[PDB]
Ligand binder design. Structure first.
Ligand SMILES: Cc1ncc(COP(=O)(O)O)c(CN)c1O
Ligand SMILES: Cc1ncc(COP(=O)(O)O)c(CN)c1O
Lengths: 382, 382
């Protein structure tokens, strides 16, 4: 017989991706709207990275790369995790994937048997629950509170652990909250994984878009229980290049490259060499990162001051480029609230699927002009 | 508890990929060996395609593309399947994936429930069985005979159909056999799918590397049951670019883009624009294709004549760039036979995992010099 599988029938395709398409299609309709839905830098990818790509193209580096990635990138990855994060990985405990998303997807497909539980901290990124269930696992949510700055309380987390717990997913800096969890809290979560024997999956793609505090890698504390996921996407404005990377226990990494060989073979060879440049050319990349960070910081402060002045509540973010705004003043719920905003000319992502009810997610990864323009419309809505 | 999943523990990572790494590492050791294991063109990707890429880089086309692919490529895809294959698809029934492999992987994840059977014709490509089982399906093998030119007998196929049959996988031109199935046989297989109500998955990536006969797309006969898989990899020497495409029933295509959104988001944006050029610039691409085909043809004939002279058997291929060679004269089995050849300085892929026992797979996608050099070593082994 014909027909789709149950797993695909159960799955929700990316909600953030979906709302972006809608806001983009509305502008084609000539509709004047300010989109605050983007989850990607407005800056183009730095020139040094583009040159590395042109150089690869010219050198004929267009053939298949190994499932785990070109050796050269793996060595630079080992160096980056070591130098920037304190992790003691070897190139063999490193892997390159089609974006950080495929690092996570291949991760779950490699460690989840049907029924295995995965603890997810809410508000969580739209994709965690979907990937966990597509692999057959069960999502166990542990709540994070705004009054606690959206930082996890390791005690609420311990109370959600069961004999079925296979993994715990931490994301700092956080999407959609923008929170940066303290070293102490991360060490605590890392200890729970060691004590109870399960995997800590640390999603660090926003590590460089930090404005206050410091970035701590739990993998320093629990090295054989931790899988660190990262990527070139946010740090270098390389979202469309599709290059992510991860490190951790050699056996899990080796399992992940196996899934890669039977699905995508390996990521784009040109994009791989381009990324090698972003990582090794420290002077040039550090320069881009410093420049983008200060621009985002400047946009964060601008946005937050405006919300405060309009009497809209929002926990002050310390990383990433998102803000969860309490929509109570606008409507009784995020869906109706997001509808009103769209009608006022501003597109936001409702917090429904992030489990951030009563809130809406804003992105300050656009021009100051757009931010100011959005703030005016918020005003009239109120 | 910690531990890998049972599905990943059951899976065999790509065998062809593995033997290539070994032959490549041996040459680094300074070992003098001729590798006939490659499954990729020796030609670099044509200039027009590289230019389209440079133009995209320069225009800042580095952001996320939609899960199904940039609209422009989908429209050109609809035009290609229509113009080149006789398929009546629309852009909405088209999808771009990270290589043809992800088209197939996402396919099976979207239509296979545990226990669903998928008929696979042997010798089959190493990855079909692995992908089928990773999604929970069961592989039902239907044998193809050398004495019948490795062309499937639709009657043996009908006798393998059961109430559990969800799909049938056809691959023409074929890897590893190089056989090109006749229009009649393809129409017959397409009818079985309609009659018994199941999916026909037609893997056509080698459509342009055809030396004798014509390429028929079964999707013309059973359009609502067929999923045509293809890619830029073989036709344009774009293996490392990771761009594949497929068309078929809108609901299945839409399910495939959903899996993409929760795994890789979308393929490389730069590689997508590069591919748009390969498809629309017909004069330039047609020129590359004609040139490469005649070079492969010239290498096929060279290889085959040499085998014939050494008294080694092999069915004469009409497409792709592989040849299944009967290794009886060399050893009692492909594994021992592949071992002897390696020591004689020639690396081949044993037919074990292709279910082509007693055979070894050779690739004539290298210089005439390499082919001649390999033929000398075959001589001394005998
Ligand atoms: C929290 C989080 N983790 C992982 C990713 C993966 O990103 P990509 O596929 O673009 O690397 C994203 C995308 N922004 C993200 O927001
Ligand atoms: C029979 C067959 N089908 C599909 C593919 C997919 O190729 P790719 O991922 O490089 O597009 C290949 C690779 N050569 C193949 O041999």
């Amino acid at each position: 017989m014909r027909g789709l599988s149950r797993r695909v029938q159960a799955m929700k395709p990316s909600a953030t991706v979906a709302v972006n398409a809608k806001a983009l299609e509305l502008r084609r309709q000539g509709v004047d709207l300010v989109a605050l839905t983007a989850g990607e830098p407005d800056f183009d990818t730095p020139e040094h990275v583009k040159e590395a790509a042109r150089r690869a193209l010219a050198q004929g580096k267009t053939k298949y790369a190994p499932p785990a990635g070109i050796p050269e990138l793996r060595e630079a990855l080992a160096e980056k995790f070591r130098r920037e994060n304190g992790l003691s990985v070897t190139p063999e405990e490193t892997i390159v994937t089609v974006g950080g998303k495929q690092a996570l997807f291949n991760l779950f497909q490699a460690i989840l048997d049907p029924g295995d539980e995965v603890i997810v901290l809410s508000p969580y990124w739209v994709s965690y629950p979907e990937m966990v269930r597509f692999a057959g696992g069960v999502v166990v949510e542990v709540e994070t509170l705004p009054e606690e700055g959206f930082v996890p309380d390791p005690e609420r987390v311990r109370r959600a652990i069961t004999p079925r717990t296979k993994a715990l997913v931490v994301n700092s800096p956080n999407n959609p909250t923008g929170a940066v969890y303290p070293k102490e809290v991360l060490e605590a979560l890392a200890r729970l994984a060691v004590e109870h024997d399960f995997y800590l999956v640390s999603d660090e793609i926003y590590e460089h878009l930090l404005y206050e505090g410091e970035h701590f890698s739990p993998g320093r504390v629990a090295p054989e229980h931790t899988l660190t996921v990262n990527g070139a996407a946010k740090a270098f404005a390389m979202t469309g290049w599709r290059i992510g990377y991860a490190c951790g226990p050699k056996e899990v990494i080796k399992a992940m490259a196996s899934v890669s060989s039977q699905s995508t073979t390996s990521p784009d060879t040109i994009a791989q060499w381009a990324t090698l440049e972003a990582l090794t050319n420290q002077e040039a990349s550090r320069a881009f990162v410093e420049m983008a960070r200060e621009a985002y910081r400047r946009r964060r402060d601008l946005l937050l001051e405006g919300l405060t002045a309009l009497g809209l509540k929002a926990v002050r973010p310390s990383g990433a480029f998102y803000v969860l705004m309490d929509t109570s003043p606008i409507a009784p719920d995020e869906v109706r609230a997001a509808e009103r905003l769209l009608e006022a000319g501003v597109a936001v992502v409702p917090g429904t699927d992030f489990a951030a009810f009563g809130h809406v997610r804003l992105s300050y990864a656009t021009s100051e002009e757009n931010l100011r323009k959005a703030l005016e419309r918020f005003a009239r809505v109120l």
